[PDB]
Amino acid sequence: SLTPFLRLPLTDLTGCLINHQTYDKCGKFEMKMMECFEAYGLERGKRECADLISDFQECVGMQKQLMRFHAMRNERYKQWLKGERKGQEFFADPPRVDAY
Amino acid sequence: MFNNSSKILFITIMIIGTLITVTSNSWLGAWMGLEINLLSFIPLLSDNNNLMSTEASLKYFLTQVLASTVLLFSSILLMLKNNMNNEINESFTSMIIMSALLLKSGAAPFHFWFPNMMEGLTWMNALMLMTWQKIAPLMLISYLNIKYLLLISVILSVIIGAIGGLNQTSLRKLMAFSSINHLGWMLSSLMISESIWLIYFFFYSFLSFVLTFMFNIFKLFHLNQLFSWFVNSKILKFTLFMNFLSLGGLPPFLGFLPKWLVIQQLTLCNQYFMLTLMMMSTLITLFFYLRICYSAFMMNYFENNWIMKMNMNSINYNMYMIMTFFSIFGLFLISLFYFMF
Amino acid sequence: SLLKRAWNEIPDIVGGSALALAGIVMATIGVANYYAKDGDNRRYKLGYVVYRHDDPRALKVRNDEDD
Amino acid sequence: MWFEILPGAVIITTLLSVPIYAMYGLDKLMIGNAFRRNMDERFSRVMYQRDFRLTDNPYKMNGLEQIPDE
Amino acid sequence: MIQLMLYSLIITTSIIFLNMIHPLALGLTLLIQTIFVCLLTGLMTKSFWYSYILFLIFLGGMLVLFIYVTSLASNEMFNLSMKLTLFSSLILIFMLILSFIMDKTSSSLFLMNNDMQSIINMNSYFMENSLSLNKLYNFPTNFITILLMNYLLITLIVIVKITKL
Amino acid sequence: MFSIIFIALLILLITTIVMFLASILSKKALIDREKSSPFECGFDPLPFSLRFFLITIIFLIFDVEIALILPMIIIMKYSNIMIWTITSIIFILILLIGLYHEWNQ
Amino acid sequence: VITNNTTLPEESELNVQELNLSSAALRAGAFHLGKQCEQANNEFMLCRQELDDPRACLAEGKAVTSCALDFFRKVKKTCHEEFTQYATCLDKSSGTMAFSHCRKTQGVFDKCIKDN
Amino acid sequence: MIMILYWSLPMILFILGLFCFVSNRKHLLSMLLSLEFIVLMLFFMLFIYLNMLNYESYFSMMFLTFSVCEGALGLSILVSMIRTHGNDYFQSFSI
Amino acid sequence: MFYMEFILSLIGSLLLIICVLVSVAFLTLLERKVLGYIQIRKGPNKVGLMGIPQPFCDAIKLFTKEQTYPLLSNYLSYYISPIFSLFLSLFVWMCMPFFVKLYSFNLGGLFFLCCTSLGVYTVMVAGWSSNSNYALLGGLRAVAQTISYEVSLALILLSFIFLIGSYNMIYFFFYQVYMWFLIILFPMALVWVSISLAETNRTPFDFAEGESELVSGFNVEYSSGGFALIFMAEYASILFMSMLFCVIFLGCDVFNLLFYMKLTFISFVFIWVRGTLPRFRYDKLMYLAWKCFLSFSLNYLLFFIGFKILLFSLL
Ligand SMILES: CCCCCCCCCCCCCCCCCC(=O)OC[C@H](COP(=O)([O-])OCC[N+](C)(C)C)OC(=O)CCCCCCCCCCCCCCCCC
């Protein structure tokens, strides 16, 4: 989060407006980043606290999971276009409707 | 500008919106405060007696809402890439954020709205425009760590803001072009400190209050109008015009101090070529300051003789003469100052 | 007087202001009645809420009869 | 005299009574259950999903005869 | 699939918004874009509250000013061209058959709906449009909506001054 | 919502088909100079009004204000009671004071 | 996310006879199910809420499923037609399965349970 | 990648509305209507951002309030020139 | 997902549309008949038997007459107003409280406010495209009154939603199982009648679409099928306001035949105030919509804020 220049009474309302702290899949990850930004500050927290930054961005940004999903779907279509996979076995056994 | 209490209401809400902008810990509450500041700065900069003020408010609206939506779009893009407000390695979305801030502030690739709007205003809304409305974008520019955009903006500000003020004989466009050059000294101070910028901005603001009060009380809008200005003693007109030499950065007066602190901090930060590029392009600013000073440095003029009484406000000129004294004798207070360190 | 003029010209606004004053009074009455008892600890929780006996919240549960 | 309005009004009472009552027949014809399942709360949608998972007709009952003897 | 249909409709209405010049016709293009934007933001969300809020605020509330100003601005009627209608229909049928020949699972949005969430999620079963709107009326974010109502009153005060009445 | 799109497109399609068949069923006569004329009573033939524009602006400000009064029915059983009451009483009271002040001035 | 390092349970451990009842057969007879099966439901949901691990307290989930199956088999032994009529009236009563639309067969079901 | 497949279209239509905002072949009313087009695209992109988080969608009516006040402000700026510049200022291609 | 839900939803919606349209025709018959009986005179008669196929005589005539245009060159904008007007009047009925499920509208009041907020849009394109100063004046007057009581209607229905605790229209049924809301909300009943005669142009609020101060507000150039679609859309709005009065105040009672008897009675009340009251003025209607009804709305909304807080502590 951005460090404001001035710490007046007028940052008290703006500060809580967006935050993963309200119930969320991994706000407990963000807290583990945010307290780290209390420890080293904002600028040393960019270097000394890089492992906890990437987990929160991985969780809520959903980057490598969606990239892995698109790698698994494009490889299946490449195998379909290259003739390795065809017919009724193009798609696997579907999950149950209440599985997830 | 105090014809109504509603304008005092708009002044305090634009102060509130600017303070919401500069204290926001996220990139979206800053945009919220920017919209509050915009809402309260649309009715100021608009009046019924002046025809050009309405189209100048239209230019201000289109320029700011073009800059605010690009600022919002790039901040949402940054939040979509990395979900914290900061960024580990700087990329193009910070460049779009900084360019949207430079359209708000008036840096020289994006400054062409600034004197074209300034050509049709009064001298108090100009005082709000070049001083308080530079608070909200410049305090957000300090959150970014890209160097070459600030380098291009500083270089273009000090050449374009100094050369472009030579042709202008209107005082408002000349002061706008002088504020564009003094903007570039503020962004050059922003790459090296967040306190030397406050020093330069506070005393540049002080010089803006004391110099725009000379043109607001006596209603001066032209270079030729300064020659016809009647002062009862020509020594007083010569003394009152030392604020131009003060703001141009001359050593015995104040106004040499913040430029000198920028020089001291930039040389200590091993940046010598950009400092030389600014100071070879600040002599032109003193040249169109000294072209104003043709109307007072000589001691006798071919005056028009129909006006023989100097008419002035009491409270405003009482506030003016305090600040004129500290604009030229304010270097004695360097021993009392402790905010440089 | 002043209330006679308001009751003569604008009687619906006077009646609405009486209703709004009554609603404000019984809103403060409802807030005081909610916070006089343990209104923050509702009797009927949503979801499936379980507490073990070591938790401090398990000692604050309500054993009242169903109304 | 004045009872000629009731030709023009009671018909209005009949026609607007049509789009529910016919459905109260029609849901008893092709479904067999007179009421379609309410999709307001999420728990009702999840349990309707469970019924359509269990049987191809979600309004077909899985009673106690489904339970094997043990 | 219908998300891709709304993508295609928004693309077609945007390119005809770029093409046309008559101001009430751009206002009509905006009012028919707002419906598709409302539905498409309804596809990502748990429930359709904010689409309704955007609908009442933008279309039925705000754009009627734009429709009134653009109606009194232009004396003349629309010059309907069958060429632009044919080009819009051709690019629309092309983009729908392009969505037919494209896998919709990879093109679907990653944002979870109310039924895309987990079954063991406790918060989804409570009340529709409850936890998202909760922070509007709780400490310490209620000062923003108090400031918003004050901002709307101050906006009306600004508008009365700048139009000069 | 996907069924709502289908039924709204069906209502639009049915109304356009009914109007197209009405245009076919309409009696086509010879088109005239005076028949196409805009109707002014009898003999053949407006500027911008600011009062109606501020009526639309007052409607817009009150509409965006109503859009913040809309959520709090749901939140009343899922929030702090004192905060909710303070915000609701303050919200409608400042609205009433602003309405009465704009009435008196 | 699931890799080869994570230890998912085998499908033979997951091959448990499940409660395959419909919504009307689960909504009806629920108030006698919860009282009879309160020892395992609370422990299993405490396992699900505390650890937040799907692989943990699988034995507790199996105990919940077996306890529900035992209660429904006990209902099937004694009071079958009354429960079938109660679930039928609960499903045909309204759209959502609301208990207030028919209370006539609920009393017969509670009378059967109280007598047996 | 993620940017190419997800949220690429609001960027493209935002640049199209920006180019319609600043083109010299349009007029001031077209600038204001294209401005509310990019307001709609900004709402689309902001809602795509805000729905990665679960229960922070309440911000969508804050940006709506600010941008609707911007639109009413722009209309009241533009129609304030009716009594001064006349009714023909809506067809102005340059400022 | 089970396909008979889609099939029965489609069948029920089309049956609702057909029955609403035939009830619109018989509502025009009822209005011409009992509106005559408001005075001494008789209603329609002598066509068919006892005047029953008189709206079909209207429908055969209006679908045969020459479709004239307000200008000869370009008139496609003239077409799009009755299409969208009848589309909204037949589309607003999907948020009717159906107990057998047709559409699970958990937010039905917002849907009603959306369709009412498009009513201004269809009457604005009705006014502008008809190329006449009378048409523009009537369109501006109708847009003025409908956005003036849009805010009031939103606040009144917003006060009603506080009673049931949610936005689901079927929740009006469970809170009316012991008594109707006509007992508790009788000034709200009079205010809601004044609201429902304002969004739909009827005689008490008729400066928009009257035959005295204008010849016709926005139907002045509309004829030969467009006037038929506009007339059917307006009477469907009357039927929707009668139903929405009968759901909120009178008990929803969707299945009972007494609910549809009360719906015909509230339509009779709408035709009863059609013959009685005179027409308001522009200044008095701006006084009514923004001061009296707005002040009553905010005040009695404060009353239900206090009452719902008071019952929350007691329950
Ligand atoms: C089965 C019923 C059969 C009979 C009825 C049949 C018809 C059905 C109902 C139709 C109703 C009429 C519809 C059209 C109305 C047209 C007239 C109209 O709009 O008039 C507007 C008029 C206008 O007000 P006005 O009359 O003051 O304004 C005109 C006078 N000037 C301009 C000079 C000021 O009335 C109102 O707006 C009244 C406000 C709403 C109603 C009152 C609510 C007040 C709050 C509740 C009571 C408060 C507590 C009181 C007790 C305690 C006091 C301390």
UniProtKB/Swiss-Prot annotation, chain B:
InterPro entries: Complex_I_Subunit_2 (IPR050175), NADH_DH_su2_C (IPR010933), NADH_UbQ_OxRdtase_chain2 (IPR003917), ND/Mrp_TM (IPR001750). GO terms for molecular function: NADH dehydrogenase (ubiquinone) activity. Its EC number is 7.1.1.2. It is a multi-pass membrane protein. GO terms for cellular component: mitochondrial inner membrane; respiratory chain complex I. Changing residue 200 to L: In strain: Oregon-R. It catalyses: a ubiquinone + NADH + 5 H(+)(in) = a ubiquinol + NAD(+) + 4 H(+)(out). It holds the Pfam family Proton_antipo_M. It is found in: Mitochondrion inner membrane. The chain crosses the membrane at residues 8-28, 60-80, 95-115, 121-141, 146-166, 195-215, 238-258, 273-293, 321-341. It comes from the Eukaryota. GO terms for biological process: mitochondrial electron transport, NADH to ubiquinone. The keyword Mitochondrion applies. Keywords: Electron transport, Membrane, Mitochondrion, Mitochondrion inner membrane, NAD, Respiratory chain, Translocase, Transmembrane, Transmembrane helix, Transport, Ubiquinone. Its main location: mitochondrion. Changing residue 277 to I: In strain: Oregon-R, SP1 and w1118iso. It is an enzyme of class 7 (translocase). Belongs to the complex I subunit 2 family. Core subunit of the mitochondrial membrane respiratory chain NADH dehydrogenase (Complex I) that is believed to belong to the minimal assembly required for catalysis. Complex I functions in the transfer of electrons from NADH to the respiratory chain. The immediate electron acceptor for the enzyme is believed to be ubiquinone. PANTHER family: NADH-UBIQUINONE OXIDOREDUCTASE CHAIN 2 (PTHR46552:SF1). This is NADH-ubiquinone oxidoreductase chain 2. It comes from Drosophila melanogaster.
Swiss-Prot record, chain C:
It is found in: Mitochondrion inner membrane; Cytoplasm, Myofibril, Sarcomere; Cytoplasm, Myofibril, Sarcomere, Z line. This is NADH dehydrogenase [ubiquinone] 1 alpha subcomplex subunit 3. Accessory subunit of the mitochondrial membrane respiratory chain NADH dehydrogenase (Complex I), that is believed not to be involved in catalysis. Complex I functions in the transfer of electrons from NADH to the respiratory chain. The immediate electron acceptor for the enzyme is believed to be ubiquinone. Required for the maintenance of muscle integrity and for cell proliferation in the wing imaginal disc epithelium, possibly by interacting with the chaperone-assisted selective autophagy (CASA) pathway. Keywords: Cytoplasm, Electron transport, Membrane, Mitochondrion, Mitochondrion inner membrane, Respiratory chain, Transmembrane, Transmembrane helix, Transport. It is a single-pass membrane protein. Disruption phenotype: RNAi-mediated knockdown in muscle results in defective muscle contraction, sarcomeric defects and loss of muscle integrity. RNAi-mediated knockdown in wing imaginal discs results in reduced wing size. GO terms for biological process: mitochondrial electron transport, NADH to ubiquinone. Complex I is composed of 43 different subunits. GO terms for cellular component: mitochondrial inner membrane; respiratory chain complex I; Z disc. It comes from Drosophila melanogaster (Fruit fly).
UniProtKB/Swiss-Prot annotation, chain E:
Signal peptide: none annotated. GO terms for biological process: mitochondrial electron transport, NADH to ubiquinone. The chain crosses the membrane at residues 24-44, 53-73, 82-102, 143-163. It is a multi-pass membrane protein. It is found in: Mitochondrion membrane. Keywords: Electron transport, Membrane, Mitochondrion, NAD, Respiratory chain, Translocase, Transmembrane, Transmembrane helix, Transport, Ubiquinone. It comes from the Eukaryota. GO terms for cellular component: mitochondrial inner membrane; mitochondrion; respiratory chain complex I. The keyword ATP-binding does not apply. It catalyses: a ubiquinone + NADH + 5 H(+)(in) = a ubiquinol + NAD(+) + 4 H(+)(out). Its main location: mitochondrion. It holds the Pfam family Oxidored_q3. Its EC number is 7.1.1.2. One of its GO terms (molecular function) is NADH dehydrogenase (ubiquinone) activity. The keyword Nucleotidyltransferase does not apply. Belongs to the complex I subunit 6 family. Core subunit of the mitochondrial membrane respiratory chain NADH dehydrogenase (Complex I) that is believed to belong to the minimal assembly required for catalysis. Complex I functions in the transfer of electrons from NADH to the respiratory chain. The immediate electron acceptor for the enzyme is believed to be ubiquinone. This is NADH-ubiquinone oxidoreductase chain 6. The gene is mt:ND6.
From Swiss-Prot, chain H:
Its EC number is 7.1.1.2. Keywords: Electron transport, Membrane, Mitochondrion, NAD, Respiratory chain, Translocase, Transmembrane, Transmembrane helix, Transport, Ubiquinone. The chain crosses the membrane at residues 2-22, 28-48, 62-82. GO terms for molecular function: NADH dehydrogenase (ubiquinone) activity. It is a multi-pass membrane protein. It catalyses: a ubiquinone + NADH + 5 H(+)(in) = a ubiquinol + NAD(+) + 4 H(+)(out). Signal peptide: none annotated. It comes from the Eukaryota. Disulfide bonds: none annotated. One of its GO terms (cellular component) is mitochondrial inner membrane. Pfam families: Oxidored_q2. One of its GO terms (biological process) is mitochondrial electron transport, NADH to ubiquinone. InterPro entries: NADH_UbQ_OxRdtase_chain4L/K, NUOK/Mnh_C1-like. It is found in: Mitochondrion membrane. Core subunit of the mitochondrial membrane respiratory chain NADH dehydrogenase (Complex I) that is believed to belong to the minimal assembly required for catalysis. Complex I functions in the transfer of electrons from NADH to the respiratory chain. The immediate electron acceptor for the enzyme is believed to be ubiquinone. Belongs to the complex I subunit 4L family. This is NADH-ubiquinone oxidoreductase chain 4L. It comes from Drosophila melanogaster. The gene is mt:ND4L.
